[PDB]
Every structure is written in structure tokens, then in C-alpha cells.
Design a protein around this ligand. Structure first.
Ligand code: MG
Ligand code: ZN
Ligand code: ZN
Ligand code: ZN
Lengths: 81, 553, 280, 120, 97, 175, 171
RNA sequence: AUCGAGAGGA
DNA sequence: CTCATAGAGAAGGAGCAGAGCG
DNA sequence: CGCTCTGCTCCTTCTCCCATCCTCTCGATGGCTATGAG
């Protein structure tokens, strides 16, 4: 589904958590970032920076009642839910 | 190299003796066990015929693997005689309410729309319940059966052309009572005799797939002959524990023992039939085997016929070993012991924050956490190494990238380490670590919380006094339930899960989970009285006191 | 037992509630999709209210002096007065409000005005008064259309759902009907002008804040309602001690209650040892 | 009518002298019991006696008693049970497991800017 | 420290299957098995450094899967073997939906 | 590796397929009418000897071109070795052998000629398999074709077999 | 004989993956697994079709760790012979046991019992040929072999066929 | 190790 | 010949009271 | 007009589960019967 993605355009705290944890993990795994390590050593704060900026290498698969799914990118989603 | 996968569809049913033999690791035929009777070994056809490993015996179907990531292997004892499985005896018994002998089908058919409506039941579990309800009236295997349309035309199908027998409870088996009992002086009262397993198998032999499936079941995964036990599994020692009490003693799975007894009993039967014996001698030995097996499998057999193991111990059957309540289902399946946990007595402390716990340094001394090496923390990590497992702000282990959990207690590396990115520095627990705390029992989220660490001298948990509200607690020796997260991701989640702000108000009634301390409240009431005024010097100290003070009097 | 009984209950992305069979238990979260965390019990000003009082509080007339508002209170009040079509503009919503009252007397025939609601205007207007430091001696810059047509738009803007089914839209419309009643009542034009003296800047500001919260009050999906509900009932259920007596009562006879009643209910035990009826 | 009336009494009598606790949710639970157009009894002959995942039903009350039928009818585990997956050491489709994070090829192209390092 | 069902219930209310699982297996269980997919049973001859893990009766050295399962779950399977009740643990969801 | 697409119906071992006979007894994997991983009915592409070379030649050039983004039979064999140096490093020797092999047995070395070959065979409604057998099979007479291919023996007239065959013979002279 | 099909390969992303050369690498990896692979299900992987335009789908996150899943689609052509299938092959080798024959990417067994009974090994006739009848067959010669079956090995496949027939024989 | 009974704690 | 040694429920069941064809 | 087949309704009978987590010591098995050496 392209413009057929009927779920909300907002990202939930659950999704947020998965994202944050994911990026924090990636930080601890020496992953590249969208926002540079500006002094701060804490991955959660580091992630928080690019998280706030929605600069996240990520898409979430939501699901339909028939088992299908929707493509919601981080940039697509509104970080307020 | 097997691909990493996840189970999506588990097909259930009963195992096929045929396939069982085909996949059998060993035939298993020895009525005895370990050391072949004092020879420092195991048994030719039991215990070691390519079966699972034991302590220091690599075996494991001669695939070694020690006994770490090493599953064992099952042998399979073919049975000379067929044994009725109890859980299916009851089912078969009910099935027999509609069974028609020699026709591969039942007493009822399509020649009656009402029967067709019973047949029209989608759920076969209900379908045959209705069939049982109906077929029990006039259970007669008529050879030719009148068609619904013009009954003068009869449809042949009653392969045994006679009345059908009824069933009565009789110990290990059931008694066949062949209907009869006809008008001519109660002619041939229901021919009484214990039902033959072979007779039942003859039924199974003639059962068609069409009708078998009209009764549900599963012609592939649940076939009627698999209700009869004709070959039994022989678990590897890990599954049917060998055991060793005190010092290198025995005490093994008594089912191995009882099974050997069953086999020995079978052997005496083998003799009774092979060399010859009274049919009653043969009868009883077999009756006993049905008995031994029934109780072997599940010792919950009709109360009275429930023998106690040779040391006066209610034979612990397969089911007994596998029961619930506690047993297995709750014993481990609904609750396992946690390696990163604690049970430590709590206490109050008015100086601490809601999520700042005064954590006993004695605990900090005993607990650690697997951090990883990054270029922006290496120096601090080498300080942990220099601190060793001695300092409370030190470390105990480091997993070297190769998978080596380095023990700093004995290592001289306190002054020497080549930390590369990602080594798991198992440091001591430090302040602010989001550790779980809880008070059981409870029927609400409030009670499980994640909080920041504040290490303390003296020990006991120094807690914000208001914590007792959401926990409905007190400080009466309550050994707080702790669980320490090992995942960084989880640590982040915990700030997003059990933070006080995220818990304090419950949508249940949408209420805050605590209020002002009763001493404080009354004091405040006094504080809010019209005559309440305060001295500057008192105020000054208060102004310092209050952390929110902006510097303005 | 109850934990297990209520275990399999959850919210899908489409916000329906269903079991593991997919059977839709409930086609909509708590019949509103709104988060209880953000719901509060408050009084609605049109459950009671005499016929006259209703009209006096809400009716506005450009020709009938009885409900004519102060022409200086509103910057353009003296201009608007006399223009019948704008009296009609107002009447559209007024007649709907009195119709709403006609409905409400049936909706909550028990006369209860105080109900758990997602929206609290009284708090909002407190915020607005403080936000702009409103000078209540000066004329307001709102127009009659800003108020009437603006609220019609506001009503239309309460987009809790994400779809295109006329039917679910209707469900949405019903869900906020109480709120549009409220807007027509608590915030009737003369209330806006006489009671609140709302400026346009404040008005506009408020509108943006209404939606902000409206959004924030929406329920998340993927929820295991079963345990959430089980805790919400079970925890207090244990606190609810005592059964058939020793907590006062009306009937002199003891009444099957507490867990005796619970149990026979839980296990469908139709054996009423205290089989009463109340016939009106 | 009886469903609603039951709830009516539930609230009036079962809740009764307590506190407000989401009457609609209370009502829902009543609806749950009767979604089939009948009424579930909280027992082995009611709640257990369903058409649902046997493993879940086993964790509720009975054991092999249930399994015997599963073997007889040759049931199959479709791996969609919430708690059942948990029992299997798997993650259930609830909360953190209710959605599947991904990085689509499409977005990976989006993640090929001057910060080419966002490509993976 | 024994895990309780209420602790589970909390994880359920939280949706914290993550933490649940790291305690469930990462800190208290898990076992690496080779299950022979073709029949859904662990009919696997353990040909470790050969990669020839023949499935007896299937003659299958290929359709075998690596699965990280609870040791207790391993036992459950084995119990079912002892119990004579089939559980063909297949990894393929043929049920479209 | 996959090569599945077709969903299963019986995961449990049953009969293990039918015998893989040349008499169009192709398996599900070699189903003449099936759907590929694009959701497109990709009928069994029973590739012929000479046209395989066209495909391979193109592929050798393809790989080389993709990399760039980042005549006698003997002359052709020389060119193949050059392409092998350009496209591999001793890997997929299966291909190395195949293309040298196909070159050695080429009968329709050029695409234009092959197009005509394809046209003749598919115009008669031959199964993809049967087309492949004839497109690759050199043949002096229909009796050879029928003996070597029984499915022609029991289905196709000799008039048509010979008509096409001698036209193919001419196309062989037209490599 | 050779069969083209749009196939797929499940490649899993792991934490080692962080840089800017996605499909570039994946194409290499794909070929490393796929090219030359040999299993009876399809025979021999002759060649992957369409090096570019690779459908890697996505990097679906696998939350158990820092891995992610890319099911990669591509076309490929394979070699597969059938019972009684007539093949213009060529000889690889020869001993007194018989011949080893090359067809495309596969080796084929053409033994002395699959060849005409009037033809026996003659070491005096080099390359170590069979030479006791008009069917003189040398290593350097070619051969029309009718594959009677496929003796699949684990790592490779050795088909088996014969030439003892009027329209079969050395080429 | 292992189960059984008893005492106690909240 | 002599010692030594190994309460409440569901479920089932039996009886008691009718319609219809030979 | 009377008797079979059938219908439901009554008592009789069997059988079931009974809170959550946690902490200790005292106890482990018992009286009876057949084969071979100096
Ligand atoms: Mg206490
Ligand atoms: Zn092993
Ligand atoms: Zn019959
Ligand atoms: Zn298998």
C-alpha cells in the first residue's frame, strides 16, 4: 500500500522504544550516525539527538486485518504519539 | 549446518508404530540395566545402543558432543501384544456406540435427512456426538438397509448382518455384550466376554478412510490403529535420568525399573505362549501387562489398582513425572529461577528520590553488568580493570571478542589489557542503573518498577517513603524482588516503561498512585492555618532547603 | 481463573478488539477510541436547565431585544444587529442545541450532568485567559462567522478516525456529538461574548490547542486489553471485602452479593437463593 | 437486553460500593462473555470448553485430558497464540512484538545522501 | 529467584516481551537444536563436522533447522515422544492466513 | 537458495514425485506451465544448445558491462577464454565447460538464424521441452527424431517433421 | 536442457554491515553461493541472469540482535537431464571401465555395458580407446549419450547414459 | 540432587 | 553335617408417563 | 383395545478444585531365605 496506508501518520511510544533501542544497539555496535557524537558518550542521548531530528535509517511494518502490511518510514511518521 | 528457523505449524496426532520402528535408534530388548551386571559398561540392547550420552560417556549415538549441547536418542521396544491406550479407550468406547462391524463404517447412513443433518455438522467433534445420540437407538448391523426414497429398496452395507454389541466396564478392558437377548426366552443373553484387542483391530482393518474422516480424526496423522500401543519409546538417560544419590549411588528413573519389570512380565508371557501354558495363565499375564502398562503410563488407574513402587512409593508413572499443578507445567514451564536477581530487605529514607534507590554496596559488590568497549570509554574501562573486582566501582569479567569471559580475580591484567571495540566488560553495578524492583503478590502494574541506583553503606534498601503507596507496602523485612536487565535496549525501554511519571496515574480510575504522607498532611494543615507565620532565619534555612529556590527572597 | 478467562483480548491496528481467533469482540475501543488516562468526570450544562433558563443562556437575537447582546461589547455588534440572515446563522446552531437538549433528556434521562469526558473547556478557558491576559473592558474582534462557521468547522475537524467509510465517519460523528453539544452549550455565542469576552486571538489560539489535545487523547493499538482490564477490575475486587451483609443496605433480607454472587454469575449457576424482582 | 441488564447489575451490585473504574470496560468484559450469543462459564466446562488453542486451555486448567483430543482430531498449532508463542520461547504479537521494524530497500536508497554512511 | 506468573502478567501489561525473553532464556534457558524439518521431528543423526545430518526414515540430510529453544521446550518434545503423541514442529506456515 | 514459489500441499513425505522421464515427465520444479518469483507465469524455459550460447555470450558481455559500470569455432573458443579472464577467476567452471562445449556443438551460431529455428518449432505447438529437444538435436530424418523422441513418434507427422527439419538443416548451413 | 527461472536468496543483514555498497556486495555474495551450485532439485547452476536490477526487498529488522532480513530475487539458468534423454555430449576421459562424458556442466557415466558389447578396451589404441569394432571411441572424440538417469552425489551430479542404439554413438 | 511432613514469615 | 551370605458442579442413569401401527 | 417404542424427567452417582511468594530441620532401607566351599 502506497497512499493506501490508512493507519495514522503518527508514531507510538512502542515504536519509539523499538527504534531507540535499535539505534542505541547500533551505536554500541559502532554503527554510522546521522548526527555526530558531539562529546556525549551515552547512545541513548546520542540517538535522542537524531531521533528528535527524525534522522533514523528505519521503516516500520504495520499490519492489516487480512495479515497484509503498511510501510511507514520514520520521516513519514510524525513523532507525536 | 542447519538454517535458523522458527516453528510455524505443529501437526499433532499419534505416532505411527510403523514409522516408529523405521526411525528407531535401537530395538531395545534387554530386561536389565547398567554394567550388564557388574562389567563396567551399560546394556547391549538398552542404555548404550546408539542412545543418548551420560556422565563422561560421550556416546550420544556415537556422536559424542559430551553432554552440553547434546540431546540424546530414543530406542523403541516393539510390543508382542497390542495394548489399549487408556486415553483412547474411553474415546473408542464412545466410538463403539455407532460402530458397525465388518462394514468399514457405521450404523447410521445418508438414508434419513435427519441423519444427513447430523452428518452436515461441520465440527466432527459435535457431529459424532449427535451420531452417538442417534445411533444408540437400535444398534443393529442390518445387512440391507432401506433407502430413504422408497424404503422397499434396501441398500446393502451391513457386513456382519446382525445386532451390535454393547460395552461394560471391566478393569483393564471392557466387556462385549452382544445385544441379542431376544424374545425367545431371553434368547442368547448379550453374548458376554471381554473384548478382544484383535477384534478391535479387525474393526480398524475394515475402517474406510471416507468414513474415518467423516468422523474427523486424521487418516494421515491420527489413524485408528495408532490408538493401540504396539511399540514403545525408550528415552535416552538425560530424558529418563540415571540419577546418583549420595556418593556415586543409583536411584535411577524407576520407570526404567518398572519397564524392565514389564518386559520381564512380558517375557514370562512369552514363555507361557512359546513353551505353552493354560489359557488362563496366558490371560492373566497379559491382563497384568495391560495393567502394568496402564499404571506405567499413568498411575491414576481407578483408585484401587494403583500399586506402590517397591520401596512403598505410589508408582511414579510417566504422567506422574509429567503432571502439572506444580509438577512441570508450573514447576518450570510457568516459572524458572533467575540468575540476575535478588531478595533484599527494604527500608525507608526521606532524603531519597522516588526513583533513586539506596542500594547496598554489599550488593554492588556481588553484582555486575556486561558493558562493551567503545573508543570513548576505553580509558574508563581500563580504570575498571585497574579497580579490578576489588573496588565497588570496578569490574569482574571481560568477554574477549573470541568469547572468553576473562576472570579478573585471578588475572594479572589489572595493569594490562588490549580492549578492542565490543569486548563485554562485565563491570560492577553503578549508580543510575535501571534495575527492576517489585513486591509480590499484586494484581496491578503498580508494584513493578525500574529505578536508578544510589549505592549506600550499611545496606537495606533506602526507599522514598511514599513508595509504600503504589506497592501497598510497609518496611517489614520485605525482601524486595529484584531483577537486573542485561540488555541495553531493555535498559532504555525501562526508562520508557516503568518510570514513575509513566506509572503514577492509573487510567483504571485515572487516579494518582499516591498522596501526601499522613504526618506531612496534618502538618501542612497546620502550616495552612491563618495563625501560621515564619521567622526569617527559619525561612533562610528553608530557602536553602528547597532545591527549587531561584535565589529570590 | 479470571485472569485466564480474560487473557485473550487485544487491540488491532484498526483499533478493533479481538481474540486470537480474530473474532472481533468489539469493533471499537471503549466505544470512542479515547484514552482513559485523558478522561475526566465533569458537568454538562444542558442536562438540567429550565426551558427559560436554557433560552436565556444560549439564545441570541438580532431583532428580538430579549436576547440582543451588547452592541459595544462586540466591536461590530452594532453593525451586525438587525441583519436577519446572521440571526439565522446563529439560529442554525441554536435550534440544533435545543434539539440536542431534546436528545440529552433521553440520552441521560437519569438527570446526571457530571460525566467522564475527554474534553474540558473550563480548564481550557482558564489557560486562555492567562495566556493572553485578556482585558475584559474592551470590545472583541471576533466576527459572528468566526464563531458560528468556525465552530462548524471545528466540529468537522474532530478527526479521530483514519479511513474513508461513511459509516465509521458516522460513528465518529456520534462520538463527538456530546462535544459539539458542549461547544454549542458551554461555549454558546453569548457565553463567548458575555461570559468569556473571548478575543479572536484567544479564539484562534484555543482552536489549535483543542486539536493538539484531541490527538494526544487517542488510544494506542496492539494492546492486551485482557490483562489491562483484568487488573483494573481484579485488583480492586480483592479490596472489595464483605459479601451479603455488614455494609448497610436497603432490603432487610440479606442479598446474595460479594463473591457468592460473583461466583454464581461466573459459573452461570442459575440457582437464585435470593431470587428477587423489582416491578415498577 | 439481558446482556445489557446483566451489566446493569454488575455495575450496580458488583461494583456498587467501590469507586469509578471505567464502566464501559466493565461492560466490555460482560460483552466478552457473551460474544458468541451465549454465556461463558468460568470453568473447565465453559471457558476451557472452547474452540481455542489447546495449549492456552491447558495452562488454564486441564492437561493431557485436552491433549488426548488434540491427538485424536490431529490438531495443529498455528503459532499465532500470544501466550503460546511465549511458551514456545517466542515473542507474542502484542506491545513490543505487535509490529515489525524494517529497513526497506526504498528507504535505504533514501539513506544514500552525502551521508552515504546511512546506507547499510 | 523463581519467576512468577504475575511477573509475566506485568510483562504482558507492559508489552515487555523483550525483558521477559532475556530472562526467560538469555538468563535461564535456551538450547541449540537441529530439527529435521521434513517431518517436523528432531530426526537428526548428529553429523556435526560432516554436515550430513541424516534423517532416518527420510534419508534427508538437508531439510533440518537450527532453532534456539528453551531446554524445557526440548524436553516437552521429548516428553511427547515418550507420550506417543505426535508434534510435527514445522517451520513453514502453509496456512496463508 | 530457494527455487520454491509454488506453495506446498503435503509437507509429510508421500510418494517423492513421479519418474523423471524424458517423455514430458517433468517435475513440479520443471512444470511446463508455472509462475516465477515476479508473479509472472514463467513457462519452463527449456533452453537450447545454440541459443544458450547466445544467452551466455550476452551474459559474458553483460557481466563485463556491469563491471564497466563500476568467425570460426576456434576463434570463438579464443574469444571465450578472453571473456573468462574478463568475467571470472576459475569460478563456475561449469560455465567454462558449458560454453566451450556449446561452441563445439553449435549448429545455429547466430541469433537471426536461431530466431527462425524458434519460429518453426513453436508454430507447431510443441511443448517447451519438445522444442528444446528439436532445437538442440541435429537430425538426418524424422525416423531419427521419432526414435530419439517418442513424443514426436506418437504425435507429429513426418511431413511436418521433415519440412521443418530440412529447413533447420538449411538454417544449420546458415549457422 | 537448461532451464531459466526467477529465483530468490535469503541474505541476512548483520551488524558487520554499515557502509555504502549494498547491492554491489550482495551481488558478489549471491554469486558466491549460487554460481556452480549443484543439487538434484535443479542440477547445475549454469548462470545467474541479470547481474544488475537485484531485488533485495528490504532489511527487515530481526530484533533478537542487530541482524535484518533481505530476501533477494534474481534469474538463473540450470542444467537438468531426464531419463532416456538423448544428448550430443563429448568425452572427458576413458579407461578400461568406460567413459566420462561432459555435457554442459555435468559429468555422465558411459560404461562398457552401456556401450555396444562388441566394443572392448584397447590400450594399444591411443588415446586409451575402445577399439574392437567399428565404434572406436577415444578421449579426444565426442559422443551422443542417452542419459538414462541422474546419479546425484551430494556435492555434484554424475548422470548415467548409454550409446548402444541405432541413433546413438560416438560423434 | 532428590521428594514427604512439620514449624514459621507477609 | 554346619553356618555364611545377598459444597458444588456436571454426568450419568433408571424409572415413570405417553402416542401409533398390527 | 392393548402393547411396543419412545419421550422426557426424576433421582442417583461419580468427580472435581481448595492463594501468592518466601524461610528452616528431621529422614532417608527393612524383615526374610536359598546355593557352594574346606
Ligand atoms: Mg509486608
Ligand atoms: Zn547430542
Ligand atoms: Zn459393519
Ligand atoms: Zn525430520
Amino acid at each position: 500500500p502506497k497512499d493506501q496506508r490508512a493507519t495514522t501518520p503518527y508514531m507510538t511510544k512502542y515504536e519509539r522504544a523499538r527504534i531507540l533501542g535499535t539505534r542505541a544497539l547500533q551505536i554500541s555496535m559502532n554503527a554510522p550516525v546521522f548526527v555526530d557524537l558531539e562529546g556525549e558518550t551515552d547512545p541513548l542521548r546520542i540517538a535522542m539527538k537524531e531521533l528528535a531530528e527524525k534522522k533514523i535509517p528505519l521503516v516500520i511494518r504495520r499490519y492489516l486485518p487480512d495479515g497484509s502490511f503498511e510501510d511507514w518510514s520514520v520521516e513519514e511518521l510524525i513523532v507525536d504519539l | 549446518s542447519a538454517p535458523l528457523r522458527t516453528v510455524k505449524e505443529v501437526q499433532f496426532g499419534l505416532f505411527s508404530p510403523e514409522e516408529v520402528r523405521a526411525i528407531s535408534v535401537a530395538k531395545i530388548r534387554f530386561p536389565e540395566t547398567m554394567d550388564e551386571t557388574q562389567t563396567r559398561a551399560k546394556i547391549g540392547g538398552l542404555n548404550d545402543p546408539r542412545l543418548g550420552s551420560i556422565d563422561r560417556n560421550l556416546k550420544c549415538q556415537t556422536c559424542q558432543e559430551g553432554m552440553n549441547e547434546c540431546p540424546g536418542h530414543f530406542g523403541h521396544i516393539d510390543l508382542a501384544k497390542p495394548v489399549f491406550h487408556v486415553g483412547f479407550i474411553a474415546k473408542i468406547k464412545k466410538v463403539c456406540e455407532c460402530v458397525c462391524m465388518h462394514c468399514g463404517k457405521l450404523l447410521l447412513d445418508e438414508h434419513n435427512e435427519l441423519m444427513r443433518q447430523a452428518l452436515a455438522i461441520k465440527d466432527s467433534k459435535k457431529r459424532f456426538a449427535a451420531i452417538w445420540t442417534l445411533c444408540k437407538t437400535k444398534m443393529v448391523c442390518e445387512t440391507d438397509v432401506p433407502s430413504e426414497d422408497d424404503p422397499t429398496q434396501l441398500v446393502s452395507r451391513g457386513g456382519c448382518g446382525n445386532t451390535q454389541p454393547t460395552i461394560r466396564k471391566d478393569g483393564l478392558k471392557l466387556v462385549g455384550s452382544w445385544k441379542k437377548d431376544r424374545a425367545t426366552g431371553d434368547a442368547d443373553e448379550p453374548e458376554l466376554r471381554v473384548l478382544s484387542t484383535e477384534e478391535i483391530l479387525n474393526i480398524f482393518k475394515h475402517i474406510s478412510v471416507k468414513d474415518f474422516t467423516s468422523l474427523g480424526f486424521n487418516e494421515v496423522f491420527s489413524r485408528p490403529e495408532w490408538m493401540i500401543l504396539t511399540c514403545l519409546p525408550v528415552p535416552p538417560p538425560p530424558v529418563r535420568p540415571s540419577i546418583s544419590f549420595n556418593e556415586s549411588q543409583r536411584g535411577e528413573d524407576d520407570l526404567t525399573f518398572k519397564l524392565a519389570d514389564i518386559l520381564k512380565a512380558n517375557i514370562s508371557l512369552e514363555t507361557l505362549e512359546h513353551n505353552g501354558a493354560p489359557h488362563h495363565a496366558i490371560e492373566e499375564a497379559e491382563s497384568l501387562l495391560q495393567f502394568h502398562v496402564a499404571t506405567y503410563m499413568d498411575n491414576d488407574i481407578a483408585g484401587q489398582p494403583q500399586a506402590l513402587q517397591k520401596s512403598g512409593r505410589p508408582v511414579k508413572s510417566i504422567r506422574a513425572r509429567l503432571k502439572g499443578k506444580e509438577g512441570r507445567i508450573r514447576g518450570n514451564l510457568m516459572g524458572k529461577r533467575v540468575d540476575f536477581s535478588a531478595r533484599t530487605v527494604i527500608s525507608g529514607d526521606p532524603n531519597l528520590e522516588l526513583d533513586q534507590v539506596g542500594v547496598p554496596k554489599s550488593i554492588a559488590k556481588t553484582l555486575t553488568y556486561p558493558e562493551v568497549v567503545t573508543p570513548y570509554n576505553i580509558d574508563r574501562l581500563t580504570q575498571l580493570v585497574r579497580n579490578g573486582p576489588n573496588e565497588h566501582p570496578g569490574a569482574k569479567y571481560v568477554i574477549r571478542d573470541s568469547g572468553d569471559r576473562i576472570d579478573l580475580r585471578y588475572s594479572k591484567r589489572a595493569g594490562d589489557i588490549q580492549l578492542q571495540y565490543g569486548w563485554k566488560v562485565e563491570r560492577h553495578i553503578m549508580d543510575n542503573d535501571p534495575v527492576l524492583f517489585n513486591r509480590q503478590p499484586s494484581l496491578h502494574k503498580m508494584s513493578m518498577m525500574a529505578h536508578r541506583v544510589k549505592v549506600i553503606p550499611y545496606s537495606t534498601f533506602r526507599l522514598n517513603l511514599s513508595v509504600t503507596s503504589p506497592y501497598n507496602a510497609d518496611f517489614d523485612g520485605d525482601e524486595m524482588n529484584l531483577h537486573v536487565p542485561q540488555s541495553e535496549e531493555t535498559r532504555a525501554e525501562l526508562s520508557q516503561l516503568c518510570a514513575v511519571p509513566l506509572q503514577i496515574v492509573s487510567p483504571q480510575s485515572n487516579k494518582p498512585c499516591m498522596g501526601i504522607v499522613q504526618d506531612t498532611l496534618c502538618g501542612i494543615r497546620k502550616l495552612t492555618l491563618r495563625d501560621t507565620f515564619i521567622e526569617l532565619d527559619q525561612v533562610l534555612n528553608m530557602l536553602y532547603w528547597v532545591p527549587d529556590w531561584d535565589g529570590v527572597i | 481463573r479470571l485472569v485466564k478467562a480474560l487473557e485473550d483480548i487485544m487491540v488491532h491496528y484498526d483499533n478493533t478488539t479481538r481474540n486470537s481467533l480474530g473474532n472481533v469482540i468489539q469493533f471499537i475501543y471503549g466505544e470512542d477510541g479515547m484514552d482513559a488516562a485523558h478522561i475526566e468526570k465533569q458537568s454538562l450544562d444542558t442536562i438540567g436547565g429550565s426551558d427559560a433558563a436554557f433560552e436565556k443562556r444560549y439564545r441570541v437575537d438580532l431583532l428580538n431585544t430579549d436576547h440582543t447582546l451588547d452592541p459595544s461589547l462586540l466591536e461590530s455588534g452594532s453593525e451586525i444587529l438587525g441583519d436577519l440572515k446572521l440571526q439565522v446563522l446563529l439560529d442554525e446552531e441554536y435550534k440544533q442545541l435545543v434539539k440536542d437538549r431534546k436528545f440529552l433528556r433521553e440520552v441521560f434521562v437519569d438527570g446526571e450532568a457530571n460525566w467522564p469526558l475527554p474534553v474540558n473547556i473550563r480548564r481550557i478557558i482558564q489557560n486562555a485567559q492567562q495566556t493572553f491576559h485578556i482585558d475584559h473592558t474592551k470590545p472583541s474582534d471576533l466576527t459572528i462567522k468566526d464563531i458560528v462557521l468556525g465552530v462548524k468547522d471545528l466540529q468537522e475537524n474532530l478527526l479521530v478516525l483514519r479511513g474513508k467509510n461513511e459509516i465509521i465517519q458516522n460513528a465518529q460523528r456520534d462520538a463527538v456529538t456530546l462535544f459539539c453539544c458542549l461547544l454549542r452549550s458551554r461555549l454558546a455565542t453569548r457565553r463567548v461574548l458575555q461570559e468569556y469576552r473571548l478575543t479572536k486571538q484567544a479564539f484562534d489560539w484555543v482552536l489549535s490547542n483543542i486539536e493538539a489535545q484531541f490527538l494526544r487523547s487517542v488510544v494506542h493499538p496492539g494492546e492486551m486489553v485482557g490483562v489491562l482490564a483484568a487488573q483494573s477490575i481484579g485488583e480492586p475486587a480483592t479490596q472489595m471485602t464483605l459479601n451479603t451483609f455488614h455494609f448497610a443496605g436497603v432490603a432487610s433480607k440479606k442479598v446474595t452479593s460479594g463473591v457468592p454472587r460473583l461466583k454464581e454469575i461466573l459459573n452461570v449457576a442459575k440457582n437464585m437463593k435470593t431470587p428477587s424482582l423489582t416491578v415498577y | 437486553a439481558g446482556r445489557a441488564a446483566l451489566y446493569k447489575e454488575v455495575y450496580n451490585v458488583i461494583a456498587s460500593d467501590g469507586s469509578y473504574v471505567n464502566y464501559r470496560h466493565m461492560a466490555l468484559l460482560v460483552d466478552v462473555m457473551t460474544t458468541q450469543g451465549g454465556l461463558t462459564s468460568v470453568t473447565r466446562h465453559g471457558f476451557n470448553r472452547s474452540n481455542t488453542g489447546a495449549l492456552m486451555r491447558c495452562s488454564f486448567e486441564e492437561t493431557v485430558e485436552i491433549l488426548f483430543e488434540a491427538g485424536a482430531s490431529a490438531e495443529l498449532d498455528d503459532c499465532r497464540g500470544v501466550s503460546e508463542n511465549v511458551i514456545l520461547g517466542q515473542m507474542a504479537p502484542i506491545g513490543t512484538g505487535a509490529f515489525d521494524v524494517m529497513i526497506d530497500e526504498e528507504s535505504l536508497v533514501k539513506y544514500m545522501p552525502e551521508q552515504k554512511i546511512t546506507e547499510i | 529467584l523463581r519467576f512468577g506468573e504475575m511477573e509475566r502478567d506485568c510483562m504482558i501489561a507492559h508489552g515487555a516481551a523483550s525483558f521477559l525473553k532475556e530472562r526467560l532464556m538469555e538468563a535461564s534457558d535456551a538450547f541449540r537444536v537441529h530439527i529435521c524439518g521434513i517431518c517436523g521431528l528432531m530426526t537428526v543423526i548428529a553429523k556435526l563436522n560432516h554436515n550430513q545430518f541424516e534423517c532416518k526414515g527420510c534419508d534427508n540430510k538437508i531439510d533440518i533447522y537450527q532453532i534456539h529453544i528453551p531446554y524445557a521446550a526440548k524436553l516437552l518434545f521429548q516428553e511427547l515422544m515418550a507420550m506417543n503423541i505426535t508434534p510435527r514442529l514445522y517451520t513453514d506456515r502453509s496456512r496463508d492466513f | 537458495s530457494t527455487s520454491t514459489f509454488q506453495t506446498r500441499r503435503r509437507r509429510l513425505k508421500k510418494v517423492e514425485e513421479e519418474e523423471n522421464a524424458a517423455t514430458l515427465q517433468l517435475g513440479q520444479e520443471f512444470q511446463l506451465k508455472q509462475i516465477n518469483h515476479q508473479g509472472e507465469e514463467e513457462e519452463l524455459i527449456a533452453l537450447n544448445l545454440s541459443e544458450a550460447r547466445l544467452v551466455i555470450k550476452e551474459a559474458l558481455v553483460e557481466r563485463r558491462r556491469a563491471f564497466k559500470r563500476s568467425e570460426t569455432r576456434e576463434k570463438e573458443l579464443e574469444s571465450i577464454d578472453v571473456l573468462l579472464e574478463q568475467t571470472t577467476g576459475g569460478n563456475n567452471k561449469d560455465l567454462k565447460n558449458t560454453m566451450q562445449y556449446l561452441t563445439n556443438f553449435s549448429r545455429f551460431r547466430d541469433q537471426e538464424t536461431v530466431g527462425a529455428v524458434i519460429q518453426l518449432l513453436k508454430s507447431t505447438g510443441l511443448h517447451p521441452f519438445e522444442v528444446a529437444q528439436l532445437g538442440s538435436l541435429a537430425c538426418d530424418t524424422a525416423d531419427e527424431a521419432k526414435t530419439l523422441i517418442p513424443s514426436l513418434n506418437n504425435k507429429i507427422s513426418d511431413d511436418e517433421l521433415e519440412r521443418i527439419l530440412k529447413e533447420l538443416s538449411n538454417l544449420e548451413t546458415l549457422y | 536442457m537448461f532451464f531459466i527461472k526467477d529465483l530468490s536468496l535469503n541474505i541476512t543483514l548483520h551488524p558487520s554491515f554499515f557502509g555504502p555498497r549494498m547491492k554491489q556486495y550482495l551481488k558478489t555474495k549471491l554469486l558466491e553461493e549460487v554460481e556452480g551450485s549443484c543439487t538434484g532439485k535443479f542440477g547445475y547452476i549454469l548462470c545467474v541472469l541479470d547481474y544488475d536490477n537485484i531485488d533485495i526487498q528490504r532489511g527487515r529488522i530481526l530484533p533478537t540482535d542487530g541482524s535484518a532480513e533481505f530476501n533477494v530475487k534474481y534469474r538463473a539458468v540450470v542444467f537438468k537431464p531426464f531419463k532416456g534423454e538423448v544428448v550430443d555430449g563429448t568425452v572427458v576421459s576413458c579407461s578400461q571401465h568406460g567413459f566420462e562424458v561432459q555435457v554442459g556442466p555435468m559429468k555422465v557415466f558411459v560404461t562398457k555395458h552401456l556401450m555396444p558389447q562388441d566394443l572392448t578396451f584397447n590400450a594399444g589404441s591411443n588415446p586409451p580407446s575402445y577399439q574392437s569394432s567399428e565404434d572406436v571411441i577415444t578421449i579426444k572424440s565426442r559422443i551422443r549419450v542417452k542419459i538414462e538417469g541422474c546419479i546425484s552425489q551430494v556435492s555434484s551430479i554424475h548422470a548415467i547414459g548409454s550409446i548402444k542404439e541405432d541413433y546413438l554413438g560416438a560423434i
